[PDB]
RNA sequence: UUAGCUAGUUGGUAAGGUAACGGCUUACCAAGGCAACGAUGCAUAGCCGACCUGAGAGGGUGAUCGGCCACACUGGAACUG
RNA sequence: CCUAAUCAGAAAGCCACGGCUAACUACGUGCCAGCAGCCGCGGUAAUACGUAGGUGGCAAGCGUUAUCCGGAAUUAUUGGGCGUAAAGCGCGCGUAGGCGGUUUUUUAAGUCUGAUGUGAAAGCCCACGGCUCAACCGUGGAGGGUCAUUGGAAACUGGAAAA
């Protein structure tokens, strides 16, 4: 159950962007609903980080606690890890219009991480790595459609747009990653 | 207490007790002793199906049944769900769990595993009470 | 003592009870509610009050909250050291933490510490589970908490020879 | 019969804190003089003055108090008490209150504060925390 | 072979009422896993004399020798202190 | 009755044998005495193999019968050359 | 709410026997030995590296995997080696 | 395993929605049927029974049951108490035991400290490498003794001797 939902109703709940948005989903949606307790705030933050990349919880906890291994602060490490996934590297660099397009691009295998075939969106990208587009498939309608627009480029990731080659450079952070979030609540959620 | 007074006694605990006092099953056959075999559930032949009522403040004709188990013990267990496809001499699988209706019954059978067939009168709690997904 | 509405503030309610006074004939009730008040930058205070309605009672609690105030000795987004709070069997225990951990505690004491501007801190409630006593014990622990400069002035020696 | 003199001195010190009196009187001892000297060297004791009369002691110490009459410590107690004696290695030696407080510890070479005891990589039997 | 300085255990005598054999009471004190305090529990090592040389109440040390009889192993090496009623 | 032999340790498809001294009565994957080296049939042609070649000479000089498999690797290494240079010299 | 247990037991001598020391077994002499710091009995149980849990001290378990032990329808015995 | 070709067409559900605990509306029912881990619902307008819609959690898994730990500081050495809440026996004499006034000298058993051997390997942790990644495996490291031997210290505990 990686992704087969509308993914808008959830964003309607969370108030986040990857007419109808002022309301709440469902019949009892648009009118007054319950308040938010601390547990609800923490769950909301968890979902607001998880549905962003479309991965699952049994993977979420593992990704969370493999970020608990290295030194430094905990949250920042968690986000620099979860934005170090393959789909984050593909989309946040500008090879798509949303996060799920990257998932279908990687599971298809259109990308060539280190110029090699890979069939998982969960691989961990690393510095000193490049990424290609399986040059045989560098000219489909969707790919060249998405690349032309200079949507955005952070300074820890590069481009040669005509060559369609991205590459990791430096460890990112919340300062270089858009869609900024709260770290204390989400780490506190996995305490109790 | 003082440290030496604590050395010369092992700091005894308040060891708990079981909630399913027939979680245990005695030696089946070829023996007279009772084994400590543990199980999450036991089968059994029901020698009578009856019905009783709880104490105050609840009021309802609650349906129960006494069952002879594999370990040749005698317990009581109420049948949940709508409708019961049991009677005397009916074998049945049994779970564990207490009900506050009245003591002398602290189990409840499982619906759909044994002779006790699942009731298809439900569509929401189907994975319990033996109901299968309808189409 | 010396309430101020000049700084920024963040009202935060801990609990509400329906509390009753029995008389001949009917049965009179009067809602109650406790609150904690702080600017989450190093200043905090709790509050209590009672009224026949929710908003008036919580307003009373808040207006009485600013009148009792706490200096909150803080350092590096954490408490300077570890302590144990004790007030009327409502014991409580706090301990500093490496950055990135976050406040972990009970609901009321989480609200107390989140609203006093502490980011990363370790603690666990003990003894009684009623919010009021453990919150008051938490504040008592913050009252008898000291920092390096608060002690280095007292002792004849200085900081940089004794430091966390 | 008195089971422990260190317990007596620390109870005298704390009971002097609760009422605040500059002067106190207590039968001295070599370990008592040394720990009093270290107390003065931390900064908690204003002055030290040993006296002699038949036979031991009696160690008279001058307390310390802040300008607003504020007690310097927030607690004081021992760790090594009879029946359950305790010891502490050099690395395992505890940092009570870190720099804030100190940890009096008796070593093969003498009694010193917690710091020097971890610097020299020689531990010993702790006696009392203070903070 | 010569590699062991045999396990020398001091102790005292408890009885002498058997031929060429005594019952040395070795004494030590050992800790507790749960707490960290010390307490002494005794043992009674039987020992092989030559001519019942040791006395009752003596202080002596012993050493590993070999299995000599039914539950008696150690031999004496040197009597430490011998005296009369104190 | 002690011989150089291998103890496989890999999981399902990439086995990882170990070079180690052992008695023939012991299980292949049971107890051992002292480890020397290891073995790996995968990831490289020629494979990657390590060897003590300092205390391994001790066990060959005081007695052991390495299998012909071990003969292959040690002859490729040439320490068994020094072993026979020590033996057949006199 | 398991308080006395032990008579080859404990010690010696001699011999035999065992790869070996040894009441290991014999005959003689002696009455000691074990036990509140828990003998003996009863009941259960193979043990361990570890596994699970816990912040930590601890608590529970002995499935795979490796080490040691005990056993091969039940009881007794011995040849080979 | 790879090449090339073809189709979104074969591939998704389970629990819960009064509080705890994130998630409400209608109808049926009306102390009946039933729910129930607890507090507890239902005798005619049930957000708690059943059903429908909607929603939340989770997922090729999900819920129940049994068992164990945590929570449980509810065996409390770290980390509990004994006026009234369970807990000071009726008290006395006293063995074994536990504990120990002040100072000096001395021993170095405890203690502290260094080395040596050892605590198999696998495992836990750390770092790296290899199976497309992860799982896993390997490598190496640290860690692990209430461990033994031995070189030093003597404040403290202990042994001896002297005030």
Could you give the C-alpha distances from F82 to F20, F51, F77, F88, in angstroms and in order? 20, 15, 10, 10
In angstroms, the CA F89 to CA F75 distance is: 18
Round to a whole number and report the distance in Å from the CA of C155 to the C1' of G55: 34
Contacts of E32 in chain B (CB under 8 A): 7
Give me the F residues in range 14-43 that sit within 7 A (CB) of strand G.
26-27, 29-31
Q: Which helix H or strand E contains B47, and what residues bound it? A: strand B42-52
A98-131 exposure pattern, b = at least 16 Cβ within 10 A, e = fewer? ebbbbbebbbeebbbbeeeebeebeeebeeeeeb
Six-digit token pair at B114?
């044994």
C154/D98 touch (CB, cutoff 8 Å), yes or no: no
**Smallest Cα distance from C12 to chain A, Å:** 12
Please tell me whether residues D38 and D62 are part of one structural domain: yes
- Of chain F, the end-to-end C-alpha distance in Å amounts to 25
Residue length of chain D: 131
Could you give the C-alpha distances from C101 to A182, C80, C128, in angstroms and in order? 13, 16, 25
Could you give the C-alpha distances from A123 to A52, A55, C104, in angstroms and in order? 17, 12, 32
The angle that helices A38-53 and A57-66 make with each other, rounded to 10 degrees, is: 100
Is the preceding omega at residue C110 within 30 degrees of 0, hence cis? no
Q: List strands edge to edge, sheet with D47-49.
A: D23-26, D59-62, D47-49
In angstroms, the CA E71 to CA E21 distance is: 11
Smallest Cβ–Cβ distance between C148 and the set D44, D100, D102 belongs to D100
**Cβ atoms of A9 and A25 closer than 8 Å:** yes
**Cβ atoms of E5 and E61 closer than 8 Å:** no
| Full residue range of the structural domain in which residue A135 is found | 82-168
In angstroms, the CA A166 to CA A96 distance is: 13
3-state secondary structure of D76: strand
Long-range contacts of F61-69 (CB under 8 A, 24+ apart): F61/F86, F63/F2, F64/F2, F64/F3, F64/F4, F64/F21, F65/F3, F65/F4, F66/F3, F66/F4, F66/F5, F67/F3, F67/F4, F67/F5, F67/F6, F69/F6
| Non-local CB neighbours of A69 within 8 Å, separated by 6+ positions | none
**Cβ atoms of F83 and F61 closer than 8 Å:** yes
Please tell me whether residues D46 and D103 are part of one structural domain: no
B59–chain D Cβ distance below 8 A for any pair: no
| Full residue range of the structural domain in which residue D122 is found | 74-131
Six-digit token pair at B125?
């709690």
Neighbours of D16 (CB within 10 A): 17
- Of chain A, the end-to-end C-alpha distance in Å amounts to 25
- φ/ψ of D37, rounded to 5, equals -60, -45
User: What does the DSSP 8-state code read for residue D99?
Assistant: T
Contacts of C100 in chain A (CB under 8 A): 72-77, 183, 187
In angstroms, the CA D34 to CA B124 distance is: 79
With an 8 Å CB cutoff and a minimum of 3 pairs, decide whether chains E and B touch: yes
Count A/C contacts: CB-CB distance under 8 Å: 29
Count B/D contacts: CB-CB distance under 8 Å: 4
Could you give the C-alpha distances from E14 to C101, D53, E77, in angstroms and in order? 64, 49, 17
| Non-local CB neighbours of B101 within 8 Å, separated by 6+ positions | B52, B53, B54, B55, B58, B62, B78
- Which residue, A44, A16, A11, is CA-closest to A185? A44
In angstroms, the CA C131 to CA C107 distance is: 8
Bridge partner list, A113: A116, A131
D85/E37 touch (CB, cutoff 8 Å), yes or no: yes
Q: Which helix H or strand E contains C158, and what residues bound it? A: none
Residue length of chain B: 135
| Non-local CB neighbours of E48 within 8 Å, separated by 6+ positions | E20, E21, E65, E68, E69, E72, E74, E75, E76
Could you give the C-alpha distances from C34 to B60, C62, C105, in angstroms and in order? 43, 8, 18
Round to a whole number and report the distance in Å from the CA of A10 to the C1' of H27: 29
Bridge partner list, C37: C11, C45
In angstroms, the CA E60 to CA E45 distance is: 12
| Non-local CB neighbours of C1 within 8 Å, separated by 6+ positions | C67, C68, C69
The rounded radius of gyration (Å) of the Cα atoms in chain A is 18
- Which residue, A187, A192, A188, is CA-closest to A79? A187
Best residue in D37, D39, D40, D43 to probe C by mutation, most C CBs within 10 Å?
D43
Residue length of chain C: 164
Please tell me whether residues D51 and D96 are part of one structural domain: no
In angstroms, the CA E22 to CA E34 distance is: 36
3-state secondary structure of C54: helix
Q: Kindly report the CATH number assigned to the domain that includes residue A143.
A: 3.10.290.10
- Which residue, B83, B81, B89, B75, is CA-closest to B22? B75
**Cβ atoms of A61 and A46 closer than 8 Å:** no
Contact residues, B window 3-22, toward D, CB-based 8 Å cutoff: 3-4
Name the residue with tokens 């648009």.
Answer: A30
Q: Which helix H or strand E contains A129, and what residues bound it? A: none
Six-digit token pair at C93?
């225990």
Contacts of D70 in chain C (CB under 8 A): 154
Interrupted backbone of chain B, residues before each interruption (C–N > 2.5 Å): none
In angstroms, the CA E77 to CA F86 distance is: 50
CA-CA-CA-CA dihedral for C88, C90, C95, C98, to nearest 10: -150
3-state secondary structure of A108: helix
Q: List strands edge to edge, sheet with C121-125.
A: C83-85, C92-95, C121-125, C103-104
Six-digit token pair at B12?
């005894």
In angstroms, the CA A114 to CA A168 distance is: 11
The angle that helices A74-82 and A57-66 make with each other, rounded to 10 degrees, is: 120
Chains with 3 or more CB pairs closer than 8 angstroms to A? C
DSSP string, A160-178: BTTTTBEEB-S---TTTSS
In angstroms, the CA F45 to CA C104 distance is: 55
Please tell me whether residues D63 and D127 are part of one structural domain: no
- CA angle (D41 as vertex; D37, D47 as ends), nearest 5: 65
In angstroms, the CA C15 to CA A37 distance is: 12
- The total domain count for chain D is 2
In angstroms, the CA F3 to CA D79 distance is: 58
Name the residue with tokens 């309430």.
Answer: C3
| Non-local CB neighbours of A178 within 8 Å, separated by 6+ positions | A92, A152
Architecture of domain C83-154 in CATH?
2-Layer Sandwich (3.30)
D100/C162 touch (CB, cutoff 8 Å), yes or no: yes
**Cβ atoms of A143 and A110 closer than 8 Å:** yes
- Of chain B, the end-to-end C-alpha distance in Å amounts to 68
Q: Residue E15: which nucleotide is closest by CA–C1'? A: G32
CA closest to C1' of H66 belongs to B40
Round to a whole number and report the distance in Å from the CA of E31 to the C1' of H112: 18
| Non-local CB neighbours of C82 within 8 Å, separated by 6+ positions | C93, C94, C95, C96
User: What technique determined this structure?
Assistant: cryo-EM
Phi/psi zone of residue B11: left (φ > 0), alpha (ψ -120 to 50 degrees), beta?
Answer: left
- Which residue, D30, D26, D23, D22, is CA-closest to D11? D26
**Cβ atoms of C127 and C89 closer than 8 Å:** yes
**Cβ atoms of B94 and B46 closer than 8 Å:** no
Name the residue with tokens 């001295």.
Answer: D28
Could you give the C-alpha distances from B30 to A161, B26, B33, B35, D38, in angstroms and in order? 81, 12, 10, 12, 79
Beta-strand runs (E) in D1-131? 23-26, 47-49, 59-62, 76-78, 102-107, 110-112, 124-130
Bridge partner list, F2: F23
- Our measurement of the distance from residue E84's CA atom to the centroid of its chain's CA atoms, rounded to an integer in Å, reads 20
> In angstroms, what is the resolution?
3.7
Six-digit token pair at B19?
């909630």
Contacts of D85 in chain E (CB under 8 A): 37-38
């Amino acid at each position: 159950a990686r992704f087969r939902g509308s993914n808008w109703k959830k964003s309607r709940r969370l108030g986040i962007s990857l007419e109808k948005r002022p309301y709440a989903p469902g019949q009892h949606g648009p009118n007054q609903r319950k308040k938010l307790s601390e547990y609800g705030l923490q769950l909301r933050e968890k979902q607001k980080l998880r549905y962003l990349y479309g991965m699952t919880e049994r993977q979420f906890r593992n990704t969370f606690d493999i970020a608990g291994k290295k030194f430094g602060v905990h949250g920042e490490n968690f986000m620099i890890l979860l934005a170090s996934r393959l789909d984050a590297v593909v989309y946040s660099l500008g090879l798509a219009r949303t996060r799920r397009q990257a998932r279908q691009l990687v599971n298809h295998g259109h990308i060539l991480v280190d110029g090699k075939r890979v069939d998982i969106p969960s691989y961990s990208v690393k510095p000193g790595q490049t990424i290609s587009v399986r040059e045989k498939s560098q000219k489909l309608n969707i790919i060249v459609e998405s690349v032309e627009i200079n949507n955005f480029v952070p300074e820890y990731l590069n481009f040669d747009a005509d060559s369609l080659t991205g590459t990791f450079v430096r460890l990112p952070e919340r300062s270089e990653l858009p869609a900024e979030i709260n770290e204390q609540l989400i780490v506190e959620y996995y305490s109790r | 207490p003082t440290i030496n007074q604590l050395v010369r006694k092992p700091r005894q605990s308040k060891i708990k007790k079981s909630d399913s006092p027939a979680l245990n099953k005695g030696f089946n056959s070829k023996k007279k002793k009772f084994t400590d075999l543990n199980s999450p559930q036991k089968r059994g032949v029901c020698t009578r199906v009856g019905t009783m009522t709880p104490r105050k403040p609840n009021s309802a004709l609650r349906k129960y049944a006494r069952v002879r188990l594999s370990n040749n013990i005698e317990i009581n267990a109420y049948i949940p769900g709508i409708g019961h496809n049991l009677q005397e001499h009916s074998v049945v699988l049994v779970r564990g769990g207490r009900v506050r209706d009245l003591p002398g019954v602290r189990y409840h059978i499982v619906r759909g595993a044994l002779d006790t067939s699942g009731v298809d009168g439900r569509r929401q709690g189907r994975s319990l009470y033996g109901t299968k997904k309808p189409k | 003592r010396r309430e101020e509405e000049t700084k920024e503030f963040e009202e935060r309610v801990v609990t509400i009870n329906r509390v009753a006074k029995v008389v001949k004939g009917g049965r009179r009730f009067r809602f109650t509610a406790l609150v904690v008040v702080g600017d989450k930058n190093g200043r905090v205070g709790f509050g209590t009050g009672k009224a026949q309605e929710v908003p008036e009672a919580i307003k009373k609690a808040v207006e009485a909250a600013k009148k009792d105030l706490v200096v909150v000795p803080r350092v590096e987004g954490t408490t300077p050291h570890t302590i144990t709070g004790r007030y009327g069997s409502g014991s409580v225990f706090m301990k500093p933490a490496a950055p990135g951990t976050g406040v972990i505690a009970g609901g009321p004491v989480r609200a107390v510490l989140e609203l006093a501007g502490i980011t990363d801190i370790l603690s666990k409630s003990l003894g009684s589970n009623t919010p009021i006593n453990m919150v008051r014990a938490t504040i008592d622990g913050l009252q008898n908490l000291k920092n390096a400069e608060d002690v280095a002035k007292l002792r004849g020696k200085t900081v940089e020879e004794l430091y966390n | 019969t008195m089971t422990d003199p260190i317990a007596d001195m620390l109870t005298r010190v704390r009971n002097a804190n609760m009422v605040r009196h500059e002067k106190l009187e207590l039968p001295a001892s070599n370990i008592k003089k040394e720990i009093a000297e270290i107390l003065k060297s931390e900064g908690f004791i204003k002055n030290v003055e040993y006296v002699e009369d038949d036979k031991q002691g009696v160690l008279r110490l001058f307390l310390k108090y802040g300008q607003n009459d504020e007690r310097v410590i927030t607690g004081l107690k021992r760790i090594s008490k009879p029946g359950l004696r305790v010891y502490a290695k050099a690395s395992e030696m505890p940092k009570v209150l870190n720099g804030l407080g100190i940890a009096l510890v008796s070593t093969s070479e003498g009694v010193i504060t917690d710091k020097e005891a971890r610097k020299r990589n020689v531990g010993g039997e702790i006696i009392a925390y203070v903070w | 072979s010569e590699r062991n300085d045999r396990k020398v255990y001091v102790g005292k005598v408890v009885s002498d009422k058997m031929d060429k054999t005594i019952t040395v009471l070795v004494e030590t004190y050992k800790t507790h896993k749960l707490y960290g305090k010390r307490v002494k529990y005794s043992k009674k090592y039987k020992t092989h004399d030559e001519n019942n040389s040791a006395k009752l109440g003596d202080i002596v040390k012993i050493q590993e020798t070999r299995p000599l009889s039914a539950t008696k192993r150690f031999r004496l090496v040197e009597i430490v202190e011998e005296s009369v009623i104190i | 009755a002690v011989k150089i032999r291998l103890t496989r340790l890999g999981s399902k498809r990439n086995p990882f044998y170990r070079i180690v001294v052992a008695d023939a009565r012991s299980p292949r994957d049971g107890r051992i005495i002292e480890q020397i080296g290891t073995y790996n049939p995968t990831s490289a042609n020629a494979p990657e193999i390590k060897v003590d070649e300092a205390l391994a000479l001790k066990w060959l000089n005081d007695g052991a019968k390495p299998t012909d498999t071990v003969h292959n690797i040690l002859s490729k290494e040439g320490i068994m050359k020094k072993f026979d240079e020590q033996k057949k010299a006199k």
